[PDB]
Amino acid sequence: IVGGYTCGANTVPYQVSLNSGYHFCGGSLINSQWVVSAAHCYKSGIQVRLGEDNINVVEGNEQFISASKSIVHPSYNSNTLNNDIMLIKLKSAASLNSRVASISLPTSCASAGTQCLISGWGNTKSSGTSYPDVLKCLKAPILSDSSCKSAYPGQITSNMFCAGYLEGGKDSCQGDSGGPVVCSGKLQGIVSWGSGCAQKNKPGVYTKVCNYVSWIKQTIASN
Ligand SMILES: N=C(N)c1ccc(CNC(=O)[C@@H]2CCCN2C(=O)COC2CCCCC2)cc1
Ligand SMILES: [Ca+2]
């Protein structure tokens, strides 16, 4: 997260870190046994880490639970990042509490101009690299589909939306992948892609969660 601020310990209790010996992606707890993340975050040997603030310091509120299974969207296309969404099941049910909470799935989509919260432990530099150890937060509006497509002609699908600032300076970035975009108290996006980070006229591109709610619900009910 570039141009953001320190969230504050566990103020984003639905935020998870995916760990394979190191943090490599964000995700979102949607109930005691299930996490939503980006398809591009897929890999074997994944451990879900809940209730984190500093990912390099054990602070006493964490729950580490291995993944029993991953389900990448059936139509995920890695070449274009269309349908960049995946579900991860926990080996054991998380013990939900103040610091470890689920985020509600949308009942509807969200409109351009809506303010959202994006968070993660990804790079905080626009040029160059610096990873924070605590969680960073960014307030960012959903952008019109037409400024999204003009930034990335022929690259935006109906399963994507842009959010951010066209002037630059404020954006998500590498390491924020798979993390939540929360608008009007629901999970409306997943950190997916972008050209660089926080660059002018290159806003962040997010998976459009409201399109996948039936798939998520059907998939978690049968797995
Ligand atoms: N908001 C941002 N500026 C932002 C930019 C990048 C990321 C991290 N995501 C990535 O690095 C993703 C995952 C793997 C391929 N990739 C890419 O961004 C690179 O290429 C994609 C290919 C499909 C068409 C768009 C370009 C996260 C955030
Ligand atoms: Ca920790």
Domain at 13-102+211-222: CATH code: 2.40.10.10
User: Is the Cβ atom of 155 under 6 angstroms away from ligand 1?
Assistant: yes
**For residue 69, how many other CB atoms are within 10 A of its CB?**
11
Resolution in Å, one decimal place: 1.9
- Name the structure determination technique: X-ray
Look at the block and give the residue holding tokens 């959010």: 163
The residue whose C-alpha atom lies closest to atom 6 belonging to ligand 1 is 193
CA distance 17 to 48: 6
Under 8 Å CB-to-CB from 165, ≥6 apart: which residues? 3, 140, 171, 203
In order of 25, 76, 165, 169, 175, the CA distances from 202 in angstroms are 21, 23, 9, 10, 18
Find out whether 91 and 105 touch, Cβ atoms under 8 Å. no
Cβ atoms of 165 and 201 closer than 8 Å:
no
The Cβ of residue 87 has, within 10 Å, a number of other Cβ atoms equal to: 22
Distance 114 CA to ligand 1 centre (A): 23
How far is 46 from 68, CA to CA, in rounded Å?
9
Q: Cβ distance 205 to 162 under 8 Å?
A: yes
141 CB-contact burial (10 Å; exposed 0-12 / middle 13-18 / buried 19+)? middle
Return the closest-CA partner of residue 96 out of 11, 185, 187, 13: 13
Element (H, E) at 217: helix 213-221
Q: For ligand 1, what atom is nearest to the CA of residue 197?
A: 3
Phi, psi dihedrals of residue 173, rounded to the nearest 5°: -160, -175
91 CA distance to ligand 2 centroid (A)? Answer: 20
Contacts of 145 (CB under 8 A, 6+ apart): 112, 156, 161, 162
**How far is residue 210's CA from residue 110's CA, in Å, rounded to a whole number?**
8
Q: Measure the CA–CA gap between 181 and 200, rounded to whole angstroms.
A: 21
Q: Which atom from ligand 1 is nearest to the alpha carbon of 79?
A: 23
Where in the chain are all domains bearing CATH 2.40.10.10?
Answer: 1-12+103-210, 13-102+211-222
Ligand 2 centre and the CA of 37: distance in Å?
20
**Strand locations in the chain (E):** 5-6, 15-19, 23-31, 34-37, 47-50, 63-72, 86-90, 115-120, 136-141, 160-163, 180-183, 186-193, 204-208
Catalytic annotation, residues = 40, 84, 177
Domain 1-12+103-210 belongs in CATH node 2.102.10.10: no
> Which among 109, 141, 136 has a CA at the least distance from the CA of 123?
136
177 is in an annotated binding site: yes
CA distance 81 to 60: 36
**Exposed/middle/buried for residue 126 (C-beta within 10 Å: 0-12, 13-18, 19+):** middle
Among protein residues, the one with the nearest Cα to ligand 1's atom 12 is 193
Q: Is the CB of 23 under 6 A from ligand 1?
A: no
- Cα–ligand 2 centroid distance for 115 (angstroms): 28
Contact 138, 51 (CB under 8 A): no
Please name which ligand lies nearest the alpha carbon of 23: 2
Tokens of 116: 């959202």
Q: For residue 43, how many other CB atoms are within 10 A of its CB?
A: 12
The answer to whether residues 181 and 163 touch, using CB atoms and an 8 Å cutoff, is: yes
How many Å apart are CA 178 and CA 203, to the nearest integer?
Answer: 16
Please tell me the distance from the alpha carbon of residue 122 to that of residue 180, in angstroms, as a whole number.
13
Q: Encoding tokens for residue 217? A: 């619900």
Residue 52 near ligand 1, beta carbon < 6 Å: no
Calpha distance 196→186 (Å, rounded): 27
Sequence-distant (6+) residues with CB within 8 A of 74 are 83
Across 7-110, the runs of DSSP E, i.e. the strands, are 15-19, 23-31, 34-37, 47-50, 63-72, 86-90
